[PDB]
Write a protein that binds this DNA or RNA. Structure first.
Ligand SMILES: Nc1ncnc2c1ncn2[C@H]1C[C@H](O)[C@@H](COP(=O)(O)OP(=O)(O)OP(=O)(O)O)O1
Ligand SMILES: [Ca+2]
Length: 430
DNA sequence: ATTATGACGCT
DNA sequence: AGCGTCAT
């Protein structure tokens, strides 16, 4: 009733760059623009592995993880851009720097939480309040929402996509009460106005297009973002939740895409998020734990309280390389040489980070995978990171893992290593 | 023979 | 600490 929380206290957005690495390469090489194209890493093995795909290529069925040779079978005219290779490994610097471009623009509008290389959450609550004070009861023109979809609309008593968009937007605005400055629906709408502005600035100043979700929390914002890709934004109101969730597979919600989501489905014998409303909070806690149970109880009602964390920079800086099948490292000289290569890229990135961001990493994490292990990581050890020196870091990394060697022979390494990973962590101000 | 990342929860 | 899960 009057004490039942509705989770409408915040305005939160999720900005998601469209086929990001592809856009980066297309900006650099105009020949790739408006073409079926993909970004690949390495080229020797089956033409290389695809890590990003343009929407033109997706129409042919091209997907991430697909080998370029196989993608060509579906899309013979597919164009390709290769990830830069340095010191024998893929180097993602161009995309990290492009990410910084976008993140710094978004930061002008509000505090952001860097979710990934090309996603950021935004808490627009305060900005919306300010903007509402300028409007002063003034209605919101549909012209201020040129790329916005209102989920669930149109509805009630045109066969084209854009036509439908406008009809929904019209119904939404027609029902708004611009008279109430505390109206959640109004707040969401102003949030979307600001996101239009943010997305316009991103495209103007970088050339990159993106999609966005606007709602009352991170999970709904994220879900909304994916509803109308690419180059569009979607508003998901609290009111839209029941119908939206009624046919929404549980795996579509952030954090429920893996084993937990599978267990929710199996244990409860349900398929859709909405079906969760029929269980008490205690019931959910009993199956999935105190934390998960509470989260699920609230989430299926469109309520979540995870805050947009003020963090624009990554917490860690890591370098990793796989050594599949026959290429698995089997000698001591091999292991040492590749640790050095990884350590050299790491030193380079750490030094840049220290100059730009006034901080120093204090811990070096070393991870390896042994041939046969199904897990991505077989072992993880840490040592002190006291100096940004590649030779020292590689030596220290070898030291902490050198006893993983079974070979009675000092020169041979067994079982062969199929993955090396160096990660700098635990930053302090400098 | 996907690969290269990155954040956070559990114990 | 070291491992697992989930995500771009
Ligand atoms: N599994 C992966 N391995 C390596 N790189 C990845 C992987 N997933 C994503 N990336 C990289 C390439 C992507 O361009 C970028 C952002 O990923 P993601 O948001 O999942 O898709 P995308 O931006 O390419 O397409 P979309 O338009 O659907 O968002 O990060
Ligand atoms: Ca993206």
């Amino acid at each position: 009733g009057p004490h039942m929380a509705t989770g409408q206290d915040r305005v939160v957005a999720l900005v998601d760059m469209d086929c990001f690495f592809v856009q980066v390469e297309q900006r650099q090489n105009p020949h790739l623009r408006n073409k079926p194209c993909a970004v690949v890493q390495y080229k020797s093995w089956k033409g290389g592995g695809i890590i990003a795909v343009s929407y033109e290529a997706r129409a042919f069925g091209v997907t991430r993880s697909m080998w370029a040779d196989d993608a060509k079978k579906l899309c013979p005219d597919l164009l390709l851009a290769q990830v830069r290779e340095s010191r024998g490994k893929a180097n993602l610097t161009k995309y990290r720097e492009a990410s910084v471009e976008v993140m710094e623009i978004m930061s002008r509008f509000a505090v952001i939480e860097r979710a990934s290389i090309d996603e950021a959450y935004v808490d627009l609550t305060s900005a919306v309040q300010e903007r509402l004070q300028k409007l002063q009861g003034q209605p919101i023109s549909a012209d201020l929402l040129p790329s916005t979809y209102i989920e669930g609309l149109p509805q009630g008593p045109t066969v084209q996509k854009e036509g439908m968009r406008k009809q929904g937007l019209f119904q939404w605005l027609d029902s708004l009460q611009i008279d109430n400055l505390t109206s959640p629906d109004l707040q969401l709408t102003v949030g979307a106005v600001i996101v239009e502005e943010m997305r316009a600035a991103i495209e103007r100043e970088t050339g990159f297009q993106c999609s966005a979700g606007i709602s009352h929390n991170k999970v709904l914002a994220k879900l909304a973002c994916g509803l109308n890709k690419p180059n569009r934004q979607t508003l998901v109101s609290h009111g839209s939740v029941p119908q939206l969730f009624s046919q929404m597979p549980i795996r579509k919600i952030r954090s429920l895409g893996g084993k937990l989501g599978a267990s929710v489905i199996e244990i409860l014998g349900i398929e859709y998020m909405g079906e969760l409303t029929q269980f008490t909070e205690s019931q959910l806690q009993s199956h999935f734990g105190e934390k998960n149970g509470s989260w699920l109880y609230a989430m299926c009602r469109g309520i979540e309280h995870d805050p947009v964390k003020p963090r624009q920079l990554p917490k860690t800086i890591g370098c990793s390389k796989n050594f599949p099948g026959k290429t698995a490292l089997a000698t001591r000289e091999q292991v040492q040489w590749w640790l050095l290569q990884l350590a050299q890229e790491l030193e380079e990135r750490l030094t840049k980070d220290r100059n730009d961001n006034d901080r120093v990493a204090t811990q070096l994490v070393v991870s390896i995978r042994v041939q046969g292990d199904k897990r991505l990581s077989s072992l993880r050890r840490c040592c002190a990171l006291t100096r940004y020196d590649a030779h020292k870091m590689s030596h220290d990394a070898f030291t902490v893992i050198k006893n993983c060697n079974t070979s009675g022979i000092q020169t041979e390494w067994s079982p062969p290593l199929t993955m090396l990973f160096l990660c700098a962590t635990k930053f302090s101000a400098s």
